[PDB]
Amino acid sequence: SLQSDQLLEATVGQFMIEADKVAHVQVGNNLEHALLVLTKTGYTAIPVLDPSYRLHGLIGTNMIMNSIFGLERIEFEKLDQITVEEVMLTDIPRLHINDPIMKGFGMVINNGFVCVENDEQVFEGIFTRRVVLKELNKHIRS
Amino acid sequence: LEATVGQFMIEADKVAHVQVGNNLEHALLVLTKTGYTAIPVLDPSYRLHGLIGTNMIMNSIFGLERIEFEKLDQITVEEVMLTDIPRLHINDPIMKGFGMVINNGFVCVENDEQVFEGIFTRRVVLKELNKHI
């Protein structure tokens, strides 16, 4: 939809995957629910929102397993005792729909995907390494 | 550009791996402690046999209203690992590796003996594409 000479002036929002196509979980859900959504959907991490649909963090299976790998056994009972808010990653920089695409491009170096929000922290979608690679590979060819 | 995969791959001795014959609980533990979502499975000859991944393991123990963690140390990685994986050579052009990491977090590099040499990752490609543009 965009030619090569338009790519570098686009915004993050024009290439993000929209929120209604991304499974998410809630800060108050337990880890078993998060693990089921991660396993069923097959994502490396999943957005964590509050009830107002606002973005709080990211949770992945490695975070969940780290909290239940116990001394002598896997303590699976803790999946029903710990909430995603206690385990999620919160130290991700925030990315906005109107931010220039290069800001997204730099952020996905260290982060597999970044959740995108608007100016009220409402979750709008995700910006991924694959999105960047898929679009860049199209334009390096041309 | 004119660069090769080998010039930017992460060398094999820097990459976490497990062995054929190891059980899924050990694989899951290595994946968890290292933060990887998939890691190579090697044999005693350092040859690449496949990739074992966190979602692969979880899906194999998705049981009746519960996750069957007790099965993990009784199932070996070779029963669950992905063997239909792309592979690169050290002299492959970087644009060839670029194309292969669109749909793969990383791609393993190996020589003609299938000896594992390293991995070519999305992160390294993006880090270099940052400077090219």
PDB file of C-alpha atoms in Angstrom:
ATOM      1  CA  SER A   1       0.000   0.000   0.000  1.00  0.00           C
ATOM      2  CA  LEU A   2       3.024   2.234   0.611  1.00  0.00           C
ATOM      3  CA  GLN A   3       5.974   2.592  -1.732  1.00  0.00           C
ATOM      4  CA  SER A   4       9.552   2.535  -0.465  1.00  0.00           C
ATOM      5  CA  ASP A   5       9.862   6.328  -0.431  1.00  0.00           C
ATOM      6  CA  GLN A   6       6.854   6.470   1.919  1.00  0.00           C
ATOM      7  CA  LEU A   7       7.935   3.859   4.478  1.00  0.00           C
ATOM      8  CA  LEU A   8      10.243   5.969   6.620  1.00  0.00           C
ATOM      9  CA  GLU A   9       7.627   8.717   7.114  1.00  0.00           C
ATOM     10  CA  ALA A  10       4.814   6.389   8.224  1.00  0.00           C
ATOM     11  CA  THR A  11       3.539   5.981  11.776  1.00  0.00           C
ATOM     12  CA  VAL A  12       3.519   2.952  14.041  1.00  0.00           C
ATOM     13  CA  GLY A  13      -0.269   2.748  13.799  1.00  0.00           C
ATOM     14  CA  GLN A  14      -0.258   2.263  10.029  1.00  0.00           C
ATOM     15  CA  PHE A  15       1.648  -1.037  10.419  1.00  0.00           C
ATOM     16  CA  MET A  16       0.503  -2.365  13.771  1.00  0.00           C
ATOM     17  CA  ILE A  17      -1.675  -5.448  14.088  1.00  0.00           C
ATOM     18  CA  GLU A  18      -5.017  -4.126  15.371  1.00  0.00           C
ATOM     19  CA  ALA A  19      -6.076  -4.946  18.930  1.00  0.00           C
ATOM     20  CA  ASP A  20      -9.233  -6.834  17.903  1.00  0.00           C
ATOM     21  CA  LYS A  21      -6.960  -9.429  16.246  1.00  0.00           C
ATOM     22  CA  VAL A  22      -4.760  -9.896  19.349  1.00  0.00           C
ATOM     23  CA  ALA A  23      -5.707 -12.063  22.301  1.00  0.00           C
ATOM     24  CA  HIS A  24      -5.052 -10.429  25.660  1.00  0.00           C
ATOM     25  CA  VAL A  25      -5.501 -11.135  29.354  1.00  0.00           C
ATOM     26  CA  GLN A  26      -6.404  -9.021  32.389  1.00  0.00           C
ATOM     27  CA  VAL A  27      -4.219  -7.864  35.298  1.00  0.00           C
ATOM     28  CA  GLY A  28      -6.541  -9.744  37.670  1.00  0.00           C
ATOM     29  CA  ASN A  29      -6.617 -13.087  35.842  1.00  0.00           C
ATOM     30  CA  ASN A  30      -4.732 -16.009  37.349  1.00  0.00           C
ATOM     31  CA  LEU A  31      -1.698 -17.561  35.672  1.00  0.00           C
ATOM     32  CA  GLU A  32      -3.583 -20.682  34.581  1.00  0.00           C
ATOM     33  CA  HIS A  33      -5.836 -18.588  32.354  1.00  0.00           C
ATOM     34  CA  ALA A  34      -2.854 -16.717  30.895  1.00  0.00           C
ATOM     35  CA  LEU A  35      -1.030 -20.000  30.267  1.00  0.00           C
ATOM     36  CA  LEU A  36      -4.064 -21.427  28.482  1.00  0.00           C
ATOM     37  CA  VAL A  37      -4.417 -18.379  26.226  1.00  0.00           C
ATOM     38  CA  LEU A  38      -0.666 -18.352  25.517  1.00  0.00           C
ATOM     39  CA  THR A  39      -0.679 -22.089  24.750  1.00  0.00           C
ATOM     40  CA  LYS A  40      -3.881 -22.060  22.670  1.00  0.00           C
ATOM     41  CA  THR A  41      -3.008 -18.982  20.611  1.00  0.00           C
ATOM     42  CA  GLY A  42       0.676 -19.922  20.438  1.00  0.00           C
ATOM     43  CA  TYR A  43       2.070 -16.458  21.139  1.00  0.00           C
ATOM     44  CA  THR A  44       5.432 -15.736  22.742  1.00  0.00           C
ATOM     45  CA  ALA A  45       3.854 -13.077  24.980  1.00  0.00           C
ATOM     46  CA  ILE A  46       0.409 -11.567  25.350  1.00  0.00           C
ATOM     47  CA  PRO A  47      -0.786  -8.050  26.316  1.00  0.00           C
ATOM     48  CA  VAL A  48      -2.087  -7.515  29.848  1.00  0.00           C
ATOM     49  CA  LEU A  49      -4.845  -4.911  30.172  1.00  0.00           C
ATOM     50  CA  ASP A  50      -7.013  -3.629  32.993  1.00  0.00           C
ATOM     51  CA  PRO A  51     -10.864  -3.645  32.849  1.00  0.00           C
ATOM     52  CA  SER A  52     -10.818  -0.228  31.120  1.00  0.00           C
ATOM     53  CA  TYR A  53      -8.884  -1.816  28.199  1.00  0.00           C
ATOM     54  CA  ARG A  54      -5.735   0.101  29.186  1.00  0.00           C
ATOM     55  CA  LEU A  55      -2.260  -1.391  28.814  1.00  0.00           C
ATOM     56  CA  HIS A  56      -0.289  -2.518  31.876  1.00  0.00           C
ATOM     57  CA  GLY A  57       2.241  -5.073  30.675  1.00  0.00           C
ATOM     58  CA  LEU A  58       3.172  -8.277  28.898  1.00  0.00           C
ATOM     59  CA  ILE A  59       3.202 -11.859  30.123  1.00  0.00           C
ATOM     60  CA  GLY A  60       4.886 -14.880  28.592  1.00  0.00           C
ATOM     61  CA  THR A  61       5.154 -18.563  29.396  1.00  0.00           C
ATOM     62  CA  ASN A  62       8.722 -18.226  30.690  1.00  0.00           C
ATOM     63  CA  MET A  63       7.566 -15.712  33.325  1.00  0.00           C
ATOM     64  CA  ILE A  64       4.790 -18.094  34.364  1.00  0.00           C
ATOM     65  CA  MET A  65       7.064 -21.132  34.519  1.00  0.00           C
ATOM     66  CA  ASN A  66       9.677 -19.187  36.497  1.00  0.00           C
ATOM     67  CA  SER A  67       7.101 -18.598  39.233  1.00  0.00           C
ATOM     68  CA  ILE A  68       6.003 -22.255  39.533  1.00  0.00           C
ATOM     69  CA  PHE A  69       9.310 -24.103  39.051  1.00  0.00           C
ATOM     70  CA  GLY A  70       9.681 -25.060  42.708  1.00  0.00           C
ATOM     71  CA  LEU A  71      12.308 -26.773  44.815  1.00  0.00           C
ATOM     72  CA  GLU A  72      11.443 -30.422  44.185  1.00  0.00           C
ATOM     73  CA  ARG A  73       8.474 -30.202  41.801  1.00  0.00           C
ATOM     74  CA  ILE A  74       6.526 -27.937  39.493  1.00  0.00           C
ATOM     75  CA  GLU A  75       4.132 -26.133  41.851  1.00  0.00           C
ATOM     76  CA  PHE A  76       1.180 -26.037  39.474  1.00  0.00           C
ATOM     77  CA  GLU A  77      -1.202 -25.117  42.310  1.00  0.00           C
ATOM     78  CA  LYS A  78       0.301 -21.613  42.234  1.00  0.00           C
ATOM     79  CA  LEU A  79      -1.243 -21.081  38.772  1.00  0.00           C
ATOM     80  CA  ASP A  80      -4.553 -20.573  40.620  1.00  0.00           C
ATOM     81  CA  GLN A  81      -2.989 -18.516  43.423  1.00  0.00           C
ATOM     82  CA  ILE A  82      -0.892 -15.922  41.559  1.00  0.00           C
ATOM     83  CA  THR A  83      -2.347 -13.208  39.319  1.00  0.00           C
ATOM     84  CA  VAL A  84      -0.807 -12.085  36.043  1.00  0.00           C
ATOM     85  CA  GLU A  85      -0.110  -8.637  37.533  1.00  0.00           C
ATOM     86  CA  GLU A  86       2.290 -10.233  40.025  1.00  0.00           C
ATOM     87  CA  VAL A  87       4.340 -11.832  37.225  1.00  0.00           C
ATOM     88  CA  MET A  88       4.005  -9.698  34.084  1.00  0.00           C
ATOM     89  CA  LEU A  89       6.763  -7.593  32.593  1.00  0.00           C
ATOM     90  CA  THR A  90       6.119  -3.891  33.124  1.00  0.00           C
ATOM     91  CA  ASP A  91       9.471  -2.344  32.106  1.00  0.00           C
ATOM     92  CA  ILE A  92       8.696  -1.973  28.393  1.00  0.00           C
ATOM     93  CA  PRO A  93       8.762   1.554  26.926  1.00  0.00           C
ATOM     94  CA  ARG A  94       5.362   2.781  25.821  1.00  0.00           C
ATOM     95  CA  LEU A  95       4.637   3.097  22.088  1.00  0.00           C
ATOM     96  CA  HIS A  96       1.858   5.235  20.605  1.00  0.00           C
ATOM     97  CA  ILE A  97      -0.221   4.931  17.442  1.00  0.00           C
ATOM     98  CA  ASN A  98       1.011   8.261  16.040  1.00  0.00           C
ATOM     99  CA  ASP A  99       4.700   7.679  16.829  1.00  0.00           C
ATOM    100  CA  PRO A 100       7.026   7.660  13.802  1.00  0.00           C
ATOM    101  CA  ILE A 101       7.708   4.173  12.468  1.00  0.00           C
ATOM    102  CA  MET A 102      11.424   4.397  13.327  1.00  0.00           C
ATOM    103  CA  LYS A 103      10.527   4.619  17.012  1.00  0.00           C
ATOM    104  CA  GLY A 104       8.787   1.278  16.647  1.00  0.00           C
ATOM    105  CA  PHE A 105      11.692   0.026  14.541  1.00  0.00           C
ATOM    106  CA  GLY A 106      14.194   0.779  17.304  1.00  0.00           C
ATOM    107  CA  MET A 107      12.027  -0.681  20.061  1.00  0.00           C
ATOM    108  CA  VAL A 108      11.638  -4.103  18.434  1.00  0.00           C
ATOM    109  CA  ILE A 109      15.417  -4.685  18.512  1.00  0.00           C
ATOM    110  CA  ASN A 110      15.210  -5.703  22.185  1.00  0.00           C
ATOM    111  CA  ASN A 111      11.521  -6.652  22.285  1.00  0.00           C
ATOM    112  CA  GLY A 112       9.842  -9.347  20.207  1.00  0.00           C
ATOM    113  CA  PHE A 113       6.694  -7.277  20.049  1.00  0.00           C
ATOM    114  CA  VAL A 114       5.613  -4.015  21.615  1.00  0.00           C
ATOM    115  CA  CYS A 115       2.038  -3.184  22.552  1.00  0.00           C
ATOM    116  CA  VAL A 116       0.726   0.031  20.965  1.00  0.00           C
ATOM    117  CA  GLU A 117      -1.561   2.454  22.811  1.00  0.00           C
ATOM    118  CA  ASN A 118      -3.148   5.851  22.295  1.00  0.00           C
ATOM    119  CA  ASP A 119      -2.761   9.002  24.390  1.00  0.00           C
ATOM    120  CA  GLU A 120      -5.066   7.580  27.091  1.00  0.00           C
ATOM    121  CA  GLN A 121      -3.070   4.318  27.344  1.00  0.00           C
ATOM    122  CA  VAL A 122      -5.913   2.426  25.666  1.00  0.00           C
ATOM    123  CA  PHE A 123      -4.577  -0.689  23.950  1.00  0.00           C
ATOM    124  CA  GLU A 124      -4.728  -0.294  20.164  1.00  0.00           C
ATOM    125  CA  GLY A 125      -2.568  -3.122  18.817  1.00  0.00           C
ATOM    126  CA  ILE A 126       0.879  -4.661  18.606  1.00  0.00           C
ATOM    127  CA  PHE A 127       4.022  -3.772  16.627  1.00  0.00           C
ATOM    128  CA  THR A 128       6.272  -6.770  15.959  1.00  0.00           C
ATOM    129  CA  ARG A 129       9.719  -7.648  14.633  1.00  0.00           C
ATOM    130  CA  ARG A 130       7.941  -9.631  11.920  1.00  0.00           C
ATOM    131  CA  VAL A 131       5.876  -6.631  10.793  1.00  0.00           C
ATOM    132  CA  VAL A 132       9.082  -4.622  10.440  1.00  0.00           C
ATOM    133  CA  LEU A 133      10.935  -7.432   8.664  1.00  0.00           C
ATOM    134  CA  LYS A 134       8.048  -8.208   6.316  1.00  0.00           C
ATOM    135  CA  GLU A 135       7.815  -4.570   5.210  1.00  0.00           C
ATOM    136  CA  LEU A 136      11.566  -3.931   5.005  1.00  0.00           C
ATOM    137  CA  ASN A 137      12.247  -7.110   3.013  1.00  0.00           C
ATOM    138  CA  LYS A 138       9.676  -5.859   0.496  1.00  0.00           C
ATOM    139  CA  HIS A 139      11.481  -2.529   0.063  1.00  0.00           C
ATOM    140  CA  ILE A 140      15.128  -3.639   0.117  1.00  0.00           C
ATOM    141  CA  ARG A 141      14.196  -5.746  -2.916  1.00  0.00           C
ATOM    142  CA  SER A 142      12.978  -2.554  -4.612  1.00  0.00           C
TER     143      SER A 142
ATOM    144  CA  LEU B   1      24.188  -6.092   1.360  1.00  0.00           C
ATOM    145  CA  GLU B   2      27.359  -7.969   0.393  1.00  0.00           C
ATOM    146  CA  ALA B   3      27.660  -9.520   3.871  1.00  0.00           C
ATOM    147  CA  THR B   4      27.094 -13.167   4.786  1.00  0.00           C
ATOM    148  CA  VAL B   5      25.125 -15.006   7.460  1.00  0.00           C
ATOM    149  CA  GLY B   6      28.295 -16.180   9.205  1.00  0.00           C
ATOM    150  CA  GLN B   7      29.505 -12.613   9.740  1.00  0.00           C
ATOM    151  CA  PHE B   8      26.450 -11.813  11.890  1.00  0.00           C
ATOM    152  CA  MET B   9      25.235 -15.128  13.287  1.00  0.00           C
ATOM    153  CA  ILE B  10      25.548 -15.916  16.978  1.00  0.00           C
ATOM    154  CA  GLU B  11      28.198 -18.628  17.191  1.00  0.00           C
ATOM    155  CA  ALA B  12      27.004 -22.020  18.407  1.00  0.00           C
ATOM    156  CA  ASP B  13      29.050 -21.957  21.620  1.00  0.00           C
ATOM    157  CA  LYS B  14      26.999 -18.896  22.683  1.00  0.00           C
ATOM    158  CA  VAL B  15      23.643 -20.644  22.056  1.00  0.00           C
ATOM    159  CA  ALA B  16      21.636 -22.664  24.584  1.00  0.00           C
ATOM    160  CA  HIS B  17      20.817 -26.216  23.502  1.00  0.00           C
ATOM    161  CA  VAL B  18      19.638 -29.590  24.740  1.00  0.00           C
ATOM    162  CA  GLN B  19      20.446 -33.139  23.653  1.00  0.00           C
ATOM    163  CA  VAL B  20      18.492 -35.918  22.031  1.00  0.00           C
ATOM    164  CA  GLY B  21      17.287 -38.091  24.867  1.00  0.00           C
ATOM    165  CA  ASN B  22      16.793 -35.246  27.358  1.00  0.00           C
ATOM    166  CA  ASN B  23      13.278 -35.017  28.778  1.00  0.00           C
ATOM    167  CA  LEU B  24      10.774 -32.197  28.259  1.00  0.00           C
ATOM    168  CA  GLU B  25      11.001 -30.935  31.825  1.00  0.00           C
ATOM    169  CA  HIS B  26      14.723 -30.259  31.368  1.00  0.00           C
ATOM    170  CA  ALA B  27      14.062 -28.596  27.998  1.00  0.00           C
ATOM    171  CA  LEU B  28      11.331 -26.444  29.527  1.00  0.00           C
ATOM    172  CA  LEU B  29      13.646 -25.483  32.407  1.00  0.00           C
ATOM    173  CA  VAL B  30      16.472 -24.425  30.076  1.00  0.00           C
ATOM    174  CA  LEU B  31      13.999 -22.437  27.963  1.00  0.00           C
ATOM    175  CA  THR B  32      12.610 -20.767  31.092  1.00  0.00           C
ATOM    176  CA  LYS B  33      15.956 -19.887  32.688  1.00  0.00           C
ATOM    177  CA  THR B  34      17.462 -18.567  29.441  1.00  0.00           C
ATOM    178  CA  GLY B  35      14.386 -16.731  28.170  1.00  0.00           C
ATOM    179  CA  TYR B  36      14.511 -18.522  24.793  1.00  0.00           C
ATOM    180  CA  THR B  37      11.240 -19.580  23.192  1.00  0.00           C
ATOM    181  CA  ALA B  38      12.950 -22.287  21.107  1.00  0.00           C
ATOM    182  CA  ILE B  39      16.397 -23.913  21.303  1.00  0.00           C
ATOM    183  CA  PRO B  40      18.327 -26.359  19.118  1.00  0.00           C
ATOM    184  CA  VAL B  41      18.352 -30.079  19.865  1.00  0.00           C
ATOM    185  CA  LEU B  42      21.790 -31.627  19.208  1.00  0.00           C
ATOM    186  CA  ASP B  43      23.310 -35.085  19.369  1.00  0.00           C
ATOM    187  CA  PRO B  44      26.673 -36.036  20.984  1.00  0.00           C
ATOM    188  CA  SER B  45      28.330 -35.224  17.631  1.00  0.00           C
ATOM    189  CA  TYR B  46      27.062 -31.605  17.864  1.00  0.00           C
ATOM    190  CA  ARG B  47      24.787 -32.241  14.871  1.00  0.00           C
ATOM    191  CA  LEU B  48      21.469 -30.393  14.655  1.00  0.00           C
ATOM    192  CA  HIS B  49      18.378 -32.605  14.911  1.00  0.00           C
ATOM    193  CA  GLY B  50      15.610 -30.050  15.461  1.00  0.00           C
ATOM    194  CA  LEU B  51      14.137 -27.274  17.602  1.00  0.00           C
ATOM    195  CA  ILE B  52      12.275 -27.701  20.893  1.00  0.00           C
ATOM    196  CA  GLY B  53      10.016 -24.838  21.899  1.00  0.00           C
ATOM    197  CA  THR B  54       7.972 -23.695  24.846  1.00  0.00           C
ATOM    198  CA  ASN B  55       4.647 -23.801  23.002  1.00  0.00           C
ATOM    199  CA  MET B  56       5.521 -27.222  21.544  1.00  0.00           C
ATOM    200  CA  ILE B  57       5.997 -28.593  25.050  1.00  0.00           C
ATOM    201  CA  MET B  58       2.871 -26.953  26.503  1.00  0.00           C
ATOM    202  CA  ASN B  59       0.679 -28.196  23.667  1.00  0.00           C
ATOM    203  CA  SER B  60       1.849 -31.772  24.261  1.00  0.00           C
ATOM    204  CA  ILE B  61       0.601 -31.676  27.883  1.00  0.00           C
ATOM    205  CA  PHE B  62      -2.653 -29.707  27.428  1.00  0.00           C
ATOM    206  CA  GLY B  63      -4.930 -32.116  29.303  1.00  0.00           C
ATOM    207  CA  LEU B  64      -8.498 -32.385  30.653  1.00  0.00           C
ATOM    208  CA  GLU B  65      -9.056 -29.035  32.449  1.00  0.00           C
ATOM    209  CA  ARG B  66      -5.398 -29.017  33.551  1.00  0.00           C
ATOM    210  CA  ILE B  67      -1.828 -28.874  32.302  1.00  0.00           C
ATOM    211  CA  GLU B  68      -0.228 -32.291  32.702  1.00  0.00           C
ATOM    212  CA  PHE B  69       3.136 -31.197  34.063  1.00  0.00           C
ATOM    213  CA  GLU B  70       3.795 -34.657  35.519  1.00  0.00           C
ATOM    214  CA  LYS B  71       4.272 -36.019  31.984  1.00  0.00           C
ATOM    215  CA  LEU B  72       7.233 -33.730  31.237  1.00  0.00           C
ATOM    216  CA  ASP B  73      10.036 -35.779  32.733  1.00  0.00           C
ATOM    217  CA  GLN B  74       8.706 -38.945  31.038  1.00  0.00           C
ATOM    218  CA  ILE B  75       8.702 -37.607  27.442  1.00  0.00           C
ATOM    219  CA  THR B  76      11.891 -37.023  25.428  1.00  0.00           C
ATOM    220  CA  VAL B  77      12.593 -33.939  23.307  1.00  0.00           C
ATOM    221  CA  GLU B  78      12.816 -36.001  20.116  1.00  0.00           C
ATOM    222  CA  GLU B  79       9.158 -37.059  20.502  1.00  0.00           C
ATOM    223  CA  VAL B  80       7.981 -33.433  20.321  1.00  0.00           C
ATOM    224  CA  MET B  81      10.721 -31.392  18.618  1.00  0.00           C
ATOM    225  CA  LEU B  82      10.310 -29.729  15.235  1.00  0.00           C
ATOM    226  CA  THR B  83      12.532 -31.371  12.617  1.00  0.00           C
ATOM    227  CA  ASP B  84      11.196 -29.610   9.495  1.00  0.00           C
ATOM    228  CA  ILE B  85      13.235 -26.469  10.090  1.00  0.00           C
ATOM    229  CA  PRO B  86      15.025 -24.101   7.696  1.00  0.00           C
ATOM    230  CA  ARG B  87      18.800 -24.114   7.680  1.00  0.00           C
ATOM    231  CA  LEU B  88      21.438 -21.635   6.540  1.00  0.00           C
ATOM    232  CA  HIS B  89      25.120 -21.895   5.578  1.00  0.00           C
ATOM    233  CA  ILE B  90      27.857 -19.571   6.833  1.00  0.00           C
ATOM    234  CA  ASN B  91      28.504 -18.186   3.343  1.00  0.00           C
ATOM    235  CA  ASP B  92      24.828 -17.574   2.540  1.00  0.00           C
ATOM    236  CA  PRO B  93      24.108 -13.941   1.612  1.00  0.00           C
ATOM    237  CA  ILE B  94      22.578 -11.958   4.447  1.00  0.00           C
ATOM    238  CA  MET B  95      19.525 -11.199   2.294  1.00  0.00           C
ATOM    239  CA  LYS B  96      18.819 -14.929   2.179  1.00  0.00           C
ATOM    240  CA  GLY B  97      18.873 -15.119   5.975  1.00  0.00           C
ATOM    241  CA  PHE B  98      16.788 -11.923   6.110  1.00  0.00           C
ATOM    242  CA  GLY B  99      14.046 -13.659   4.121  1.00  0.00           C
ATOM    243  CA  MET B 100      14.089 -16.717   6.381  1.00  0.00           C
ATOM    244  CA  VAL B 101      13.661 -14.812   9.674  1.00  0.00           C
ATOM    245  CA  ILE B 102      10.469 -13.090   8.537  1.00  0.00           C
ATOM    246  CA  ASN B 103       8.566 -16.177   9.705  1.00  0.00           C
ATOM    247  CA  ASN B 104      11.161 -17.648  12.104  1.00  0.00           C
ATOM    248  CA  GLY B 105      12.509 -16.041  15.269  1.00  0.00           C
ATOM    249  CA  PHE B 106      15.869 -17.504  14.315  1.00  0.00           C
ATOM    250  CA  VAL B 107      17.316 -19.941  11.794  1.00  0.00           C
ATOM    251  CA  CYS B 108      20.073 -22.443  12.550  1.00  0.00           C
ATOM    252  CA  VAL B 109      23.355 -22.372  10.622  1.00  0.00           C
ATOM    253  CA  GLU B 110      25.074 -25.682   9.922  1.00  0.00           C
ATOM    254  CA  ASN B 111      27.817 -27.136   7.743  1.00  0.00           C
ATOM    255  CA  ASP B 112      27.607 -30.036   5.286  1.00  0.00           C
ATOM    256  CA  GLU B 113      27.909 -32.596   8.120  1.00  0.00           C
ATOM    257  CA  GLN B 114      24.840 -31.025   9.804  1.00  0.00           C
ATOM    258  CA  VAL B 115      27.222 -29.858  12.546  1.00  0.00           C
ATOM    259  CA  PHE B 116      25.606 -26.924  14.350  1.00  0.00           C
ATOM    260  CA  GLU B 117      27.471 -23.653  13.821  1.00  0.00           C
ATOM    261  CA  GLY B 118      25.221 -20.916  15.208  1.00  0.00           C
ATOM    262  CA  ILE B 119      21.925 -19.122  14.788  1.00  0.00           C
ATOM    263  CA  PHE B 120      20.811 -16.207  12.638  1.00  0.00           C
ATOM    264  CA  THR B 121      18.272 -14.145  14.554  1.00  0.00           C
ATOM    265  CA  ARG B 122      15.662 -11.475  13.854  1.00  0.00           C
ATOM    266  CA  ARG B 123      17.409  -9.178  16.328  1.00  0.00           C
ATOM    267  CA  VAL B 124      20.760  -9.194  14.519  1.00  0.00           C
ATOM    268  CA  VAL B 125      19.086  -8.470  11.172  1.00  0.00           C
ATOM    269  CA  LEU B 126      17.148  -5.553  12.628  1.00  0.00           C
ATOM    270  CA  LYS B 127      20.249  -4.210  14.371  1.00  0.00           C
ATOM    271  CA  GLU B 128      22.098  -4.053  11.044  1.00  0.00           C
ATOM    272  CA  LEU B 129      19.093  -2.777   9.076  1.00  0.00           C
ATOM    273  CA  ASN B 130      19.044   0.130  11.537  1.00  0.00           C
ATOM    274  CA  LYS B 131      22.446   1.318  10.321  1.00  0.00           C
ATOM    275  CA  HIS B 132      21.894   0.584   6.618  1.00  0.00           C
ATOM    276  CA  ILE B 133      18.859   2.862   6.538  1.00  0.00           C
TER     277      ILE B 133
END
